[PDB]
Amino acid sequence: PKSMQCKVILLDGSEYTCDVEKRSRGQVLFDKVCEHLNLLEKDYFGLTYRDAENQKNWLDPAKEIKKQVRSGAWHFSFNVKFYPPDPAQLSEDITRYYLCLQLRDDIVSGRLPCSFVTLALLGSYTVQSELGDYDPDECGSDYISEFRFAPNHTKELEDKVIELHKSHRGMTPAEAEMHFLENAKKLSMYGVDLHHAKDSEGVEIMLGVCASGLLIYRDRLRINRFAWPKVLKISYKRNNFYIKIRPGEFEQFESTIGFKLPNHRAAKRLWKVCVEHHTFFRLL
Numbered sequence: 001p002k003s004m005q006c007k008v009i010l011l012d013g014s015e016y017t018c019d020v021e022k023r024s025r026g027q028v029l030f031d032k033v034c035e036h037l038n039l040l041e042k043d044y045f046g047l048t049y050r051d052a053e054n055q056k057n058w059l060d061p062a063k064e065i066k067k068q069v070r071s072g073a074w075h076f077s078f079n080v081k082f083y084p085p086d087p088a089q090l091s092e093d094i095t096r097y098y099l100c101l102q103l104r105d106d107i108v109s110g111r112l113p114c115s116f117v118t119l120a121l122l123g124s125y126t127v128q129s130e131l132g133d134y135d136p137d138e139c140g141s142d143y144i145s146e147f148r149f150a151p152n153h154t155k156e157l158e159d160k161v162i163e164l165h166k167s168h169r170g171m172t173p174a175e176a177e178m179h180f181l182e183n184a185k186k187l188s189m190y191g192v193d194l195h196h197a198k199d200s201e202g203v204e205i206m207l208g209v210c211a212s213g214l215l216i217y218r219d220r221l222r223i224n225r226f227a228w229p230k231v232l233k234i235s236y237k238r239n240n241f242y243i244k245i246r247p248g249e250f251e252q253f254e255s256t257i258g259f260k261l262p263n264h265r266a267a268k269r270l271w272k273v274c275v276e277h278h279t280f281f282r283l284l
């Protein structure tokens with residue numbers, strides 16, 4: 001048997017290396033990553049890789065690794081795929097811990113926009129989880145945490161993290177991580193996977209896919225959203241993505257909404273993440 005070396009960026013930025021038989025399916029590598037992370041609730045998570053267009057793809061667990069990475073390196077990231085709308089109901093603390101790590105990266109990267117105070121508050125729960133109770137000895141008036149809290153840091157933000165940290169005295173890691181999630185889960189973009197598209201008029205939009213349904217971000221004004229129950233069929237042809245919206249009451253005929261994606265692979269990818277998030281909603 002011929003093994004291939006796999007490299008996986010873990011959610012704390014560390015690198016895990018293992019080997020799998022060259023014909024192995026994605027689930028094989030994923031199972032090894034989950035065993036290493038001591039993770040049981042693994043179906044909220046996935047592996048990503050970068051294709052030749054350099055686009056983030058989900059590694060399909062059903063399909064051979066080699067038929068997905070193709071010409072690329074066997075380099076992956078471990079990630080949350082299905083953001084739980086109710087993290088309090090996850091059976092395990094370790095699940096909630098990896099979820100926090102993903103959300104920390106969603107925030108720092110700017111994928112999850114956050115008000116100043118909420119950046120400070122989430123920061124404060126992360127420090128309490130990582131360092132324990134506020135300690136003046138460690139932090140002077142010129143203190144700057146090693147922790148990344150935000151896409152841009154200011155001394156004011158570092159100050160607010162410390163002030164809020166002071167109030168979490170006696171909070172255990174699992175409790176800090178639960179408070180982190182009870183706040184993060186209310187952010188408008190929590191678990192929203194954004195794809196660039198154009199509408200039927202050629203105007204550039206973002207299509208958001210999440211637990212609750214589909215979002216169309218035209219501009220700040222009039223945001224369209226479709227709960228999963230209102231979506232009958234989703235399809236792609238060529239560069240185009242179509243959503244079939246279930247007929248409202250006493251309206252004879254459904255409405256089809258079509259979008260232009262940058263290319264056929266962008267369309268296929270959006271279809272697959274939509275189908276998967278629709279099946280996830282169904283499982284709630």
Ligand SMILES: Cc1csc(NC[C@H]2CCCO2)n1
Nearest residue numbers: 043082276277279280281283
């Ligand atoms: C019971 C079970 C475990 S994984 C799964 N389905 C695979 C993807 C689609 C929905 C979320 O996860 N069902």
